[PDB]
Structure formats: structure tokens, C-alpha cells
Amino acid sequence: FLAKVFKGGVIAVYLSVILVVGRGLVRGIFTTSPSTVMFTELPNADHLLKICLDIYLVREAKDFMLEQDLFAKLIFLFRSPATLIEWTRMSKKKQE
Amino acid sequence: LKICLDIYLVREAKDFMLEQDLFAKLIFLFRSPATLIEWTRMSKKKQE
Amino acid sequence: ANRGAVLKNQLIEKEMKEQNEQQKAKFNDIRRRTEAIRERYQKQIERGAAERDFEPVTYGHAKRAGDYYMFKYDPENDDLVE
Amino acid sequence: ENFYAHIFNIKCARQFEAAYPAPRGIPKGKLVKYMMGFPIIIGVVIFIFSPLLLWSLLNQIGTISMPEKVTLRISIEGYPPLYEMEAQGSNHDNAELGMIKPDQLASLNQALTDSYTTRDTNSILRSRMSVSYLKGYTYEDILI
Amino acid sequence: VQSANDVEKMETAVSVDWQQKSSATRLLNAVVNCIGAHTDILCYFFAIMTQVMTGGLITLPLPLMSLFWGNLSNPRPSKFFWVTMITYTECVIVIKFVCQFAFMPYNSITWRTEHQMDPMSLDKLFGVSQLWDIVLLFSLFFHRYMLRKLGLWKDANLPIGRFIHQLFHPKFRYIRDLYPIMFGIDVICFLIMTFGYSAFGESRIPVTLVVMLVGMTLAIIIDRALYLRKSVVGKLIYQVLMIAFLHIWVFLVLPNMTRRSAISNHVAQALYVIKSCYFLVSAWQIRNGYPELCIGNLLTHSYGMTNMIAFKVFMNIPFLFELRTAIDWTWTDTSMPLFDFFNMENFYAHIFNIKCARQFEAAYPAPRGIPKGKLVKYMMGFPIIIGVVIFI
């Protein structure tokens, strides 16, 4: 029945997967678009985890005033790459 | 393009110290749009 | 046929050999010169700032050493000739 | 939630890289290159050529058994048949339905060659075609 | 008048200056001079064509001998190998003439009928021993061109030892990089094998042998990629092994694996002739030492219109850019892991595309302020409208 089929159609589905998989999955993992270099190439990602842990700790102790003031602070860091660099650079512990 | 051609030319002449110092330079240009503009603007040849 | 052709072939072979060696020498000398001027210019800017931050010896640890002080020169202002 | 996941992944990747640092400047060792670049090469290769192998193994042309029952009828149209006969048998040994001895096949093939004439090329071409037709059937695929 | 004997220079010179529009008469003279100077290659090409035509073993020594001896004899095959060539050419002509009689069992009655379909009956494996048209034309051209070569040699000029002379003692070294030609020939071979598959298989099956051939050609492309890092002994071994394997497979295994006799299989001949042209350039590269090999793709040496389309295609097909980058990384003395290698490759491609687009835009500038002409609007906006319409 495999023979019964049209080489046109089967070759079509095959090249279609190779292209959909090649353009969706393999490309994505092997490549990194130039825009997504200012967010993944970060020397030291420990000053930004603190803010998230704070906003999660505050969420349990009420303080909904504090839960919004500090969420807003994280929003501007992903809007200003000048400050993201200033905050994700290394500290004196590595400097010495 | 000059930086990329340099890092490819260096890759053949050994100098793996130079192959990393200059790759790092390209990484910061795609992190700082302020400097990318400063470096991709026109030169005096077009200016005059 | 007995005389001229072989002498001409030897002459053209010798001339081609000399030209080939000259081209190889010039190319290698230029490649050395540009490598040296690129090493000197890279060394030059690092001495200017001296941010006292060293680098642990690791691929990746020194691949993210980029900063502002390495782009403080015009990308065309360099007087290699007198 | 997404921002927290992003930060966490970067942090723990930095921790992993700092766990087993490798000296700078030294070119990559041959061992690691053979264990890292190789498997991705074979992976891409068999990712490309696995459907082809699957199809080639899946086609698998088959075979079916030989007939055992043969019937013949002779009639004037629109009326009961004037003659009808049956030829059954599965052992392929009885005279009604049996295979062909290699002597008979050899005789037929030999007779096919000498049918032509010396001059006409059409006769030669016909003889070649008729012989090529017969050779596609072994004596185990011919029924008398 | 004969003092203008600088043919070695004017070969390349006329190639370069005929690359452009020169409808002058000096072309026929220059082409004649080039064909006279490069007459050594012509005889090998005609030997290959002769063996393609015979499809047998009686001529089998003629291409194997030419390749192994004279394509691997550094300065010249020494003017004695030509005598053996002409003696065996004479002998093959006479022996095949004697075999072209009618009192032997090669009659129309029995032998023709019996051995039409089997591909390696006796006297088909033994060269020309068989219906025939005039055929034997390339044998005559081979004889004539060997004699012409003798005439031109006398007109101007006239195993350990051979190994040392070809490897370690070249008086002259013409530095030349001929990898893209070999890669292009191998791509053409890949296309002819992929598009034409009915002949390699005896609605029919795509068979299991085809997959093996495509895997093998991918492996040999990979191996050629490895060897472009200053491997001469590896190149020599690869070439000898490949020549023997190609000859044996094409002339002794394919007919039993497809039930199609040689001489009749018309894509096997194209594969055999195209592949053998690769062996000539490869032998040239073996005899003449490898260059310094400046790294960088051939698709980026200039910034033009063909480079746009070439790069677009190169980055278009999946599993092509990544495969090339991986193969490069595994076999090059780098210092980055594999992800930084891929990152740098993508960055270079990006920059190159922007640069050459700027060059294209500066090539044919259009005055500012003037509204777009009606003509260009009708040739640009229209076809996309009908394209969307018929796509829907």
C-alpha cells in the first residue's frame, strides 16, 4: 500500500517535517537571536534573583503596597539595558 | 565585518588569547544599543 | 625545436618561481604586520582604564569581559602611516 | 513567573560553569571534541535519513501462493453452457494441474531462438523480445 | 616569432581576459594555444571516455594506469609511460578487431539470445568481445591524440623513487586552491544520485541500497572536509582507496545489484564520468602542495548579487549551516566550546547580509523626493497581489 501511494505526496510530507522541524526546533536551540544576548549573556545573575524572592516572600506576609512597588522595579530593568548591565556586573568579591 | 574577519584570521594563526578577547568585544556590542549606534554610523568619507 | 623551447621553458619557470616566492613573502609580512598592530592596539586600551578586576582562568569567565572602556576610540582614527 | 524562571536558569548555569572551570587559552582537547561534536553529527545524519530507512524496510514486497482451481466454459451467449470442465489439485503432481519439467522449458527456449531469418532485422528483434519475455519466469512459476 | 613561448602565463591570462566581453578574433587563437598546452589532460579524459564506452576489463588497465602512473608523476610522466600507453593502445585495437569476427561462438543463434539479460556473462566482463553500430570512435580519437602528444613533446621539449619525487622533491610548487571545484562536482553527483534513483534499484521500491549510497557520499564529503587541513598522506590514501572502490563498485557490483548491465545504464555512466573529473583535480592538488588556506566561506569574498542569492540558499536549507559549523568545529584548532562557535557564525552571517544589501542599494541609487514611478509600481505591487490571490 506504501507502493499504492503517490511519491509526490509522501516526499511532500517528508520534506515538510524536515523543514518544519529544522525551522522550529533545531534552529532555536543551536542559534540565539542577537536581541536575546542582552538577557542571556549576563555575567552574574544573583542580584536579580533577590528581587523575585523578595516579591514572593512579601506575597505571603500581606504588604500589597510592597508587592507592587518592587514588581514595578523589575519591569524597568527589562526596559533599560543600560541599568541591566549596571546591575548584572560582578561585585568586589570576584574583583579581589 | 572587520572584527569577524579578524577573529577568523586569528583562528588560523593560533593566538587563542586574541581569539577570546575580541569575541568578547562583539558580545557587548549586541548588549549595548548605545554603542552599536556609535559604531555603525557613517564615517568622514561619506560625510564629505 | 632543439634549442629555443627548453631555454625559454627554463627561463619562464625560474621567473615564475621568483615571483611566487616574492608574493608569499609579501603576504606573510603583511599578515605579521597587521597581527602586531592589532595586538598593540588591543593592549593599548586595556592599560588606559585598569579597573583592577582580574579574570579567573575560564572560557566564558573571560568571554564576558566586555565593557565601555574598550570602545573609546574612533573606529577609523588610526595613523599607521606617517 | 516567567521572569523568575529566566533568572533562575541563568544563575544555576553560572554555578555549573563555576563548579568545574577549565583553564583559559588552552585549545580544546581532542577527547572532548570527539565526544561532543561527533554525536551531534551522527544525530543529524540519522535524523535526516531515518524516514528513508523506515520506508525502505516498510515497503517489503510480498508473495502469494499459486492457483489450485481452474475452470473453463464454452457457450452461446444467453444460454446454459455447452461445455464446462474443472482442474483441481494442490500437490502439483497429477496430470490435470502440474508444474513444468526443465526439459520442456529448455525446448521452448531453444525453439524461440531459431525462429528468425538471416536477413531481416525485425525477425531478430522479435526473437530477442520473445526470449526476454520467457526468462522472467522460473520453472517454479509456470503451470501446465 | 617563436620567442612568444610564454604559453604557461597566457593560459591564465586569456582565461581572465575572456571572462569578460571580448568578441575579438584573438579568442580562437588563444583557445587553440590553451588546448595545445593542456593536451596532457585531454588524453586522460579520452581514456576515461573509452572505458565508459567499453564497460569491460580489456580496457580496464588504461584509466587505472593513467591515473596511478601519470597523474601521480610530479613534473611529467617521463616520456616512457607514453610508449607503454601507445603499445597497449595498439594492442587493444588489434585484439578487439580480431575479436570482432564471426566464426567464434558469438553468433546470432545461441550466444546473443542466452546472455541478453544477465549483466556479467563472459565476454562482457572481458571488454569488447560482443547489434553494434559504428561505436569505436573514442578508441580512434585516443590513438590520434596520443600521437599528437608525441608530436608536441618532440616539437618543443624532447616505487620509492616515485614517492620521494612526487612528495618531498618538487623543484616547483604552483600554489593553487581547488577545493570549491571538487565540492561542486560532489554536489552535482549528489543531485544526480538523488533525482535519479530508478536505475540504482532493480511503483517499485526506494530499496535499501540507495540509503547506503547516500550515507556513503555524505561520509566521503565529510572526510574531504577533514582532509582540507594539510593532510597529504591522508589525501593520497583517500584518493587511491576511492579510485579502487569506485571502479570496482561501478563495473563489478552495481550490475549484480540492479540487474542492469553496464553500457546500458545511462546514469551510472554520468556518475562515473563526473566522479573521474574529480580525481583529476584531486591529483593536481596532491602533486602541487597545499596552500596556506585562508579561512572563510567561498560565498563571501566579495559583496555582490550572486553572493546574496548564494548566502540566502546556504542559510535556507535546514541541517546545512549547522552541519557545516559542527564539522568545522570538530576539526579546527579553536578555543571556544560549540555554542560560542555557533553564535559567532550567526553574527558573521548577519553582518554580511547587511553589508551586501547596503552595497546593492548604493549600486543603483534613486533620486530622493520623487514619488515612485508608475512602471515600477505595476511590476512590483501587482505580482504579489496575484501571488496572494492564487496562493489562497
Swiss-Prot record, chain C:
Q: What is the tissue specificity?
A: Expressed in the pharyngeal-intestinal and spermathecal-uterine valves and in multiple reproductive tissues including the germline, somatic oviduct, and spermatheca. During reproduction, it is expressed in sheath cells, sperm, both spermathecal valves and the spermathecal bag cells.
* Effect of inactivating the gene: Reduced brood size due to defects in ovulation with incomplete constriction of the sheath cells impairing oocyte transit, an accumulation of ooplasm in the uterus as a result of 'crushed' oocytes, caused by incomplete opening of the spermathecal-uterine valve, which in wild-type allows the fertilized oocyte to be expelled into the uterus, and sperm navigation defects.
Q: Which residues of the full protein are shown?
A: 1336 to 1417 of 2442
Q: What name appears for this protein in its UniProt entry?
A: Piezo-type mechanosensitive ion channel component 1
Please explain the role this protein plays, according to its UniProt record: Pore-forming subunit of a mechanosensitive non-specific cation channel. Generates currents characterized by a linear current-voltage relationship. Plays a role in reproduction by positively regulating inter-tissue signaling to promote oocyte maturation, ovulation and fertilization, and sperm navigation from and to the spermatheca. May play a role in regulating cytosolic and endoplasmic reticulum calcium ion release.
Family of the protein in this entry = Belongs to the PIEZO (TC 1.A.75) family.
Q: Where in the cell is it found?
A: Cell membrane
Provenance organism: Caenorhabditis elegans
Q: What else is known?
A: Piezo comes from the Greek 'piesi' meaning pressure.
